[PDB]
Amino acid sequence: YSVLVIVSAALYLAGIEAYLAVMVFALVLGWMNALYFTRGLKLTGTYSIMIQKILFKD
Amino acid sequence: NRPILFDIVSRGSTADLDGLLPFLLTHKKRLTDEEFREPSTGKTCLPKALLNLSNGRNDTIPVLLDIAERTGNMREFINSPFRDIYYRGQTALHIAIERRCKHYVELLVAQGADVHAQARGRFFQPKDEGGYFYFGELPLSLAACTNQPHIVNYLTENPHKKADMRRQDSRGNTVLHALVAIADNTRENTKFVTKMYDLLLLKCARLFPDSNLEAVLNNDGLSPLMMAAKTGKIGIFQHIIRREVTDEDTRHLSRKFKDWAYGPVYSSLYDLSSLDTCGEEASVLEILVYNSKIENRHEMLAVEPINELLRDKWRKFGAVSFYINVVSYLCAMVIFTLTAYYQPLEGTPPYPYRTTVDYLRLAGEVITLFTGVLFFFTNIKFQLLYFIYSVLVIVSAALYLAGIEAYLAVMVFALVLGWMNALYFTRGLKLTGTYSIMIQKILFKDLFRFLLVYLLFMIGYASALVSLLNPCSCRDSETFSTFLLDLFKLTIGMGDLEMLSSTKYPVVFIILLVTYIILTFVLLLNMLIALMGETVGQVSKESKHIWKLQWATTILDIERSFPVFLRKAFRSGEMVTVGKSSDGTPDRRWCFRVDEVNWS
Amino acid sequence: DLFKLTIGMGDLEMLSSTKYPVVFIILLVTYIILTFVLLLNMLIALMGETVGQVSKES
Amino acid sequence: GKIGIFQHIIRREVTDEDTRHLSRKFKDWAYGPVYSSLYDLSSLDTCGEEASVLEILVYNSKIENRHEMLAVEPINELLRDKWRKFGAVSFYINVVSYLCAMVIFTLTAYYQPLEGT
Amino acid sequence: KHIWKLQWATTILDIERSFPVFLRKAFRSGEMVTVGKSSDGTPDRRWCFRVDEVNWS
Numbered sequence: 089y090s091v092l093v094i095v096s097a098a099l100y101l102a103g104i105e106a107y108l109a110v111m112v113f114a115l116v117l118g119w120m121n122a123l124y125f126t127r128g129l130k131l132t133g134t135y136s137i138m139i140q141k142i143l144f145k146d
Numbered sequence: 147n148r149p150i151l152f153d154i155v156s157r158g159s160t161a162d163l164d165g166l167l168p169f170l171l172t173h174k175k176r177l178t179d180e181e182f183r184e185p186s187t188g189k190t191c192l193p194k195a196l197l198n199l200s201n202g203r204n205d206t207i208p209v210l211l212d213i214a215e216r217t218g219n220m221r222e223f224i225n226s227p228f229r230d231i232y233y234r235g236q237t238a239l240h241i242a243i244e245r246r247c248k249h250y251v252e253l254l255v256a257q258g259a260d261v262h263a264q265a266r267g268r269f270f271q272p273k274d275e276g277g278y279f280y281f282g283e284l285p286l287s288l289a290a291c292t293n294q295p296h297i298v299n300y301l302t303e304n305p306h307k308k309a310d311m312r313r314q315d316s317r318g319n320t321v322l323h324a325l326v327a328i329a330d331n332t333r334e335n336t337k338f339v340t341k342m343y344d345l346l347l348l349k350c351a352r353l354f355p356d357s358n359l360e361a362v363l364n365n366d367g368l369s370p371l372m373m374a375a376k377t378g379k380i381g382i383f384q385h386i387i388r389r390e391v392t393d394e395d396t397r398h399l400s401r402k403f404k405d406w407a408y409g410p411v412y413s414s415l416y417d418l419s420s421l422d423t424c425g426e427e428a429s430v431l432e433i434l435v436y437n438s439k440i441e442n443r444h445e446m447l448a449v450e451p452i453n454e455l456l457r458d459k460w461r462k463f464g465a466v467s468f469y470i471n472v473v474s475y476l477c478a479m480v481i482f483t484l485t486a487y488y489q490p491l492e493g494t495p496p497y498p499y500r501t502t503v504d505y506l507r508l509a510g511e512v513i514t515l516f517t518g519v520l521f522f523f524t525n526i527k528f529q530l531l532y533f534i535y536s537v538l539v540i541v542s543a544a545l546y547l548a549g550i551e552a553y554l555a556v557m558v559f560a561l562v563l564g565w566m567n568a569l570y571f572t573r574g575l576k577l578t579g580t581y582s583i584m585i586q587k588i589l590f591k592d593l594f595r596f597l598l599v600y601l602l603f604m605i606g607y608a609s610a611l612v613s614l615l616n617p618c619s620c621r622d623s624e625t626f627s628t629f630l631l632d633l634f635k636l637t638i639g640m641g642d643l644e645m646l647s648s649t650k651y652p653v654v655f656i657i658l659l660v661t662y663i664i665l666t667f668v669l670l671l672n673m674l675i676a677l678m679g680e681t682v683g684q685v686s687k688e689s690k691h692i693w694k695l696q697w698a699t700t701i702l703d704i705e706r707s708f709p710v711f712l713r714k715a716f717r718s719g720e721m722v723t724v725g726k727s728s729d730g731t732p733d734r735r736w737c738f739r740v741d742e743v744n745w746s
Numbered sequence: 747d748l749f750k751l752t753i754g755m756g757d758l759e760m761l762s763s764t765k766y767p768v769v770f771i772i773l774l775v776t777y778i779i780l781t782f783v784l785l786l787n788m789l790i791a792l793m794g795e796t797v798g799q800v801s802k803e804s
Numbered sequence: 805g806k807i808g809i810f811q812h813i814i815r816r817e818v819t820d821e822d823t824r825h826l827s828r829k830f831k832d833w834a835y836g837p838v839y840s841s842l843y844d845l846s847s848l849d850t851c852g853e854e855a856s857v858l859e860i861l862v863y864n865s866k867i868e869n870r871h872e873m874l875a876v877e878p879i880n881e882l883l884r885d886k887w888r889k890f891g892a893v894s895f896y897i898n899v900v901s902y903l904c905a906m907v908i909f910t911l912t913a914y915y916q917p918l919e920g921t
Numbered sequence: 922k923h924i925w926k927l928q929w930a931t932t933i934l935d936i937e938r939s940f941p942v943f944l945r946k947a948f949r950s951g952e953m954v955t956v957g958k959s960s961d962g963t964p965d966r967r968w969c970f971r972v973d974e975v976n977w978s
């Protein structure tokens with residue numbers, strides 16, 4: 089997430105419009121990452137434990 | 147001073163104490179004097195002498211006792227209670243019994259120690275009530291709960307002061323109640339608790355035969371058997387249920403009499419006192435099925451007399467009444483549905499009844515009123531759902547009579563609620579043993595948690611995507627709301643993908659859309675495989691357990707619904723002339739026959 | 747119309763006729779909940795007695 | 805993943821006075837059945853000074869016996885005390901901080917004008 | 922059925938590792954107690970955690 093946001097900032101400083109897309113992708117990862125906080129809840133625990141990271145890499 | 151005396155007592159030196167004795171007698175200062183008592187705890191010299199002992203015996207305590215009897219203040223000196231909140235009411239006798247030393251215990255009892263002293267400090271309160279060791283708040287209870295049979299024998303049988311083993315706590319607990327309270331389910335604890343419970347019950351029978359120590363009930367109204375049932379102590383509950391006394395002098399205490407036993411089969415008369423009470427007394431069945439929330443209940447209902455009693459109740463008045471209930475409620479609901487559908491289309495409330503069909507509809511309406519008033523009176527004298535259904539029916543009838551045309555809304559809502567009450571929200575056994583909705587554990591209130599995570603994830607994804615959509619007016623938050631609606635429509639169904647017209651880069655939009663769809667599918671698969679996993683993984687021993695709990699709940703509800711006379715009419719078991727009682731008359735106690743099989 | 751809304755091809759022209767929109771909406775949303783529960787339990791039983799057949803079985 | 809020796813080391817008691825400083829579970833006070841034992845938190849809670857047995861236990865241990873060792877009374881009660889002292893408060897603070905940061909990021913990207921280059 | 926304990930332990934250790942070392946020591950668990958004399962004769966000041974238990978045997 090941080091690499092993506094820094095890449096977007098580097099593109100924005102460069103003057104490349106493409107930043108929005110890269111920056112948008114980072115934001116998406118930020119919402120997915122918030123599930124770590126929801127790991128404890130029983131309903132979405134099984135999804136937050138291993139799906140969101142390992143399943144996202146695969 | 148305090149420190150020098152305490153140090154001399156701790157080191158066990160007697161010469162210094164004998165040299166301080168003339169000071170004590172000359173200063174007319176008793177050991178109980180405020181200068182010698184510890185300020186924070188109210189502690190006296192004697193409990194300190196009891197606490198720190200070497201090799202089990204030291205002369206410090208006898209020298210203190212001689213000093214106190216010489217100053218003549220022994221009675222106050224012995225019964226000096228600790229005063230701090232941590233240790234309140236503790237007496238030297240409690241510490242003497244505590245340290246497993248019998249000789250100090252008997253010395254203190256002979257000198258005149260109070261035997262019924264109650265220690266109700268925060269340390270001695272039950273573990274749940276901010277405490278540490280709830281030993282029963284009594285020296286005899288302390289001796290019993292610390293596994294000191296000799297101390298119990300001495301306290302209960304001594305010439306100096308006889309301990310009243312029928313004594314009750316400030317909480318009302320007897321020594322048997324204390325033994326139940328300290329009991330756990332481990333092997334050694336259950337072992338010595340059962341052995342000492344038998345010892346104490348037999349002793350109380352021997353001392354004064356008429357009263358049974360189990361008859362004494364806690365301030366909450368719970369007998370030791372009832373207390374074990376409520377708290378969930380499987381070991382002592384099991385032992386009390388099948389207590390058999392081989393001694394013929396006191397056999398009234400025994401509950402599991404043996405009619406005959408050839409080989410593995412044992413035919414036993416289990417006493418049903420306080421189990422099938424029939425409303426005269428609280429029932430161990432009622433407490434076990436309703437109040438006790440411990441998982442041990444699953445095993446607690448597994449004892450032979452309780453299981454066979456529930457099966458007998460089901461055979462006698464369980465199945466027939468359950469079928470009558472379900473059939474009657476289904477017929478009432480069918481009548482309600484027919485009345486609601488066939489309500490007259492044209493007219494104003496109230497509506498006239500002219501033809502025979504109108505009279506049939508009126509009969510259905512009065513049947514509904516009968517059901518509603520029945521439920522109202524049943525709950526008022528409190529099943530919330532039935533109460534809501536009944537009050538909705540009543541207000542619907544009131545609106546119908548008063549002329550309000552809103553009778554159709556409340557009445558149909560009551561229809562749906564009544565149907566769901568029978569089918570969806572089952573209090574006991576399900577209307578059908580094979581039920582399509584039986585497997586699900588989803589609740590209407592729970593559904594909101596299921597939907598909320600979807601809503602939050604979707605709104606977050608949409609908030610991410612509208613920012614990319616903004617280049618395309620679009621900057622207004624109204625466009626954000628429109629894209630929320632459009633994305634919900636797209637994720638629920640095909641939406642032509644018009645938004646890719648707005649985006650500068652459609653490829654990243656495609657990647658985001660496909661990853662969002664697959665993530666949503668995986669999240670759905672997880673939150674639905676949870677139920678499937680519970681269905682294929684948790685029916686191994688739990689399904690039959692929850693079925694047994696439902697069946698017991700239905701049996702007890704039907705049993706309570708009956709009037710007292712009919713309840714006694716359907717009483718299980720038979721009067722048995724089990725044997726000659728102590729007074730010389732035969733003993734007549736309700737018993738249940740159990741043919742238990744044990745393969746050697 | 748009710749079947750069409752259950753499938754997804756329904757239209758909310760039903761709500762225009764009714765005198766009391768709020769209770770009608772409440773009843774319909776509850777009905778969707780119960781129909782979804784019925785279909786979910788059907789699929790649960792389907793998958794359960796499908797996986798009842800195992801590798802040794804097949 | 806060796807549970808037995810791990811329990812023995814975390815609950816070690818030696819009686820010999822010369823070598824009684826090797827104990828880790830010191831009885832403090834007793835009252836019949838109940839008694840209080842002070843377990844030694846050496847390598848169980850180093851506060852980041854060195855490797856801590858708890859951290860190796862949660863992350864590095866890939867054995868199926870991880871839950872048994874986490875159920876050992878010193879470790880379990882230490883985790884419960886950590887949760888009680890600052891676990892819930894700091895967890896909710898982190899949740900609120902992330903949520904607000906993500907909302908801020910969503911707003912700033914949205915309101916961004918992107919007028920030309 | 923077993924993951925939840927492990928996941929809560931992960932949550933608490935991450936939160937505790939997020940803190941600076943001085944903040945780590947500020948919220949230490951247990952208290953110093955004079956357990957006894959060491960080999961050299963000096964008392965051993967050890968951070969110890971009090972656990973209350975029962976033994977019926």
Ligand SMILES: CCc1cccc([C@@H](O)CO)c1
Pocket residue numbers: 471524703704706707
């Ligand atoms: C006889 C059927 C019946 C009607 C009303 C209440 C009950 C029980 O719920 C009593 O609590 C049963």
